[PDB]
Amino acid sequence: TRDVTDDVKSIVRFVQEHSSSQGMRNIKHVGPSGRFTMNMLVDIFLGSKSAKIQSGIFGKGSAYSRHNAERLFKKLILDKILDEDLYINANDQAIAYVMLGNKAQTVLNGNLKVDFMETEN
């Protein structure tokens, strides 16, 4: 039903912004520790107040039910727009964190439109 292209474009723009300090000579890289879990991305999006970041896309998710906002990211991974790798921390825990998939650049070029099915329950 509902077309979510502009939202995904911004989610993608956003995820990539928090990957480096783009600009100054040393384009130094973030993560794995500074990368987001899907859940932290949901929280941020749904302008939660446990959100790690509270700028960029913080407001944007306010018309989505948590359940849906979830399903949207699940989709964005599936669709290879966003992807997720594992990180192992010092206490030997495996944490799945998000990053762009080979499809992210596509959506940023108007070339893919993203549509979403709003689910109840």
Side-chain angles (χ1 to χ4, degrees), residues 7-34:
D7 295 19
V8 188
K9 290 189 178 187
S10 36
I11 293 177
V12 169
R13 247 112 82 182
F14 176 79
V15 166
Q16 113 177 140
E17 182 204 328
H18 292 282
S19 319
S20 52
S21 66
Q22 69 299 80
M24 168 208 67
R25 183 72 167 89
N26 282 51
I27 321 264
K28 279 181 199 176
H29 312 302
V30 187
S33 298

Side-chain angles (χ1 to χ4, degrees), residues 9 12-14 22 27 45 50 69 72 76 88 102 106-107 119:
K9 290 189 178 187
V12 169
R13 247 112 82 182
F14 176 79
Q22 69 299 80
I27 321 264
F45 185 48
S50 303
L72 178 77
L76 305 193
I88 309 188
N102 33 56
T106 319
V107 192
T119 295

Side-chain angles (χ1 to χ4, degrees), residues 3 49 94-95 104 108:
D3 172 307
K49 233 276 196 233
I95 295 138
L108 304 174

Side-chain angles (χ1 to χ4, degrees), residues 1-4 7 45 61-72 75 115-121:
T1 332
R2 200 240 286 237
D3 172 307
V4 297
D7 295 19
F45 185 48
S62 21
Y64 302 65
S65 128
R66 167 162 292 268
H67 169 74
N68 279 317
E70 267 152 4
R71 287 191 46 258
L72 178 77
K75 184 173 143 71
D115 263 76
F116 177 44
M117 183 192 71
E118 295 262 42
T119 295
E120 278 288 320
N121 187 77

Side-chain angles (χ1 to χ4, degrees), residues 47-65:
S48 167
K49 233 276 196 233
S50 303
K52 173 179 174 179
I53 290 306
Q54 304 185 12
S55 70
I57 71 162
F58 184 66
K60 294 276 211 316
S62 21
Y64 302 65
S65 128

